[PDB]
Amino acid sequence: LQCYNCPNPTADCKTAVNCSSDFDACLITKAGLQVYNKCWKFEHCNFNDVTTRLRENELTYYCCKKDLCN
Structure with a gap:
């Protein structure tokens, strides 16, 4: 379960990392122009x-829920 994203705006x-557990x-948030991409709790x-x-x-x-999904 990786993620193609970046911590700050x-x-x-969108470096690939892994943060599930x-x-x-x-x-992958897309507010206006800055995407607030982070890991999230499936539910x-x-x-x-x-x-x-x-x-x-x-x-x-x-929000994807399979892998980096990117």
């Missing part, structure tokens, strides 16, 4: 529950 970075729902990709702790509102996040 990175528009030019209890959260393999790899969320939390409802609506804004993903970018809730990562700034929520009317974004367009895509």
Whole structure:
């Protein structure tokens, strides 16, 4: 379960890493332009529950749950 993402608001970075254990729902947030991509708890990709702790509102996040999914 890896993840093609970057910790801070990175528009030019999605290094591949692995952070699941209890959260393999790899969320990719796309707020305005900065994508808040981080790892997530499978049982939390409802609506804004993903970018809730990562700034929520009317974004367009895509959370995969299989592997880097990128």
